[PDB]
Design a protein around this ligand. Structure first.
Ligand SMILES: O=P(O)(O)OC[C@H]1O[C@@H](O)[C@@H](O)[C@@H](O)[C@@H]1O
Ligand SMILES: O=P(O)(O)OC[C@H]1O[C@@H](O)[C@@H](O)[C@@H](O)[C@@H]1O
Ligand SMILES: *[C@@H]1O[C@H](CO)[C@@H](O)[C@H](O)[C@H]1NC(C)=O
Ligand SMILES: *[C@@H]1O[C@H](CO)[C@@H](O)[C@H](O)[C@H]1NC(C)=O
Lengths: 148, 152
């Protein structure tokens, strides 16, 4: 059962994170895509979001030439929650060539509570690529699973 | 004069973070506190934005005070600040806290503060949410607070 991989040895991961992955299980089968920029974004929870078997959890597609860039891989997942929100992070994306000390890309998704939908309104917020390190692409989406 | 330090040498800091830093200025003069837990683990968490929250000039941005003896533990230092915002929230992270002795591979503590929009106050409801010390890395103390500055 291939899915999101958390830090730590298999079967010895944080119970907090494991519980959140369980809570989001109903979203695994879904696919989320941005609406509208020269790029489109596709996001999935613990499942391949790309079309190149790269293990992507979130990909960026350049519309003009179809280039698919891996923003983050689900084999490097972090997930935590607050009152009415859940933050999901996928590290290990394709490396930058000139920005951010050439570190691997990363996806940060802020899922906010919304009692009216199981999941929707996924869209990019911005890309932070102006730092020497710890850069990231930020996204937001709504989900009733984030309510609590 | 000492304030939050962002990653990167002077002139190499993120334009986004620099702008956000300036936006947070009205919060610098404030101080926040919240007591939670039960002895012998009752703590008093003191948080400040880009200013010393501790009583030992350690550059702490957020401290955990052991109520049983008043001992101060640094959760995060503001010279290791990261800040970013979304549509109706702002997340502040202070790394460089005191090292754990038995958890998280002894990495330095870290404070993560989720600031949610509230048009009724400049800042209120500072609340400790939880502590994640069960991972091999990337552990952290999580807090929440309200602020009109997080409103778009
Ligand atoms: O790889 P470099 O040269 O640093 O350029 C980085 C840029 O590449 C483009 O293809 C996109 O993925 C942008 O979102 C990214 O910021
Ligand atoms: O330092 P160790 O032995 O790993 O114990 C870690 C614990 O210490 C206590 O004093 C508090 O700061 C707790 O929040 C922390 O989780
Ligand atoms: C994530 O997947 C990539 C692609 O195979 C792999 O190189 C990397 O080691 C994985 N990350 C971890 C933590 O194993
Ligand atoms: C953060 O403060 C600590 C405390 O002295 C210091 O050692 C560290 O260098 C500071 N962070 C940076 C990047 O200067």
């Amino acid at each position: 059962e291939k899915t999101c991989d958390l830090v730590g040895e298999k079967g010895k991961e944080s119970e907090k994170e494991l519980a959140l992955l369980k809570r989001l299980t109903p979203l695994f089968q879904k696919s989320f895509e941005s609406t509208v920029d020269m790029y489109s974004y596709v996001f999935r929870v613990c499942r391949e979001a790309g079309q190149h078997s790269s293990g992507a959890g979130l990909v960026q597609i350049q519309k003009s030439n179809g280039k698919e860039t891996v923003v983050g891989r689900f084999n490097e997942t972090q997930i935590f929650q607050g009152s009415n929100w859940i933050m999901l992070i996928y590290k290990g994306g394709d490396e930058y060539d000139n920005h951010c000390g050439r570190e691997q890309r990363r996806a940060v998704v802020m899922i906010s509570c919304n009692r009216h939908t199981l999941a929707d309104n996924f869209n990019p917020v911005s890309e932070e690529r102006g730092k020497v390190q710890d850069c990231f692409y930020l996204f937001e989406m709504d989900s009733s699973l984030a309510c609590s």
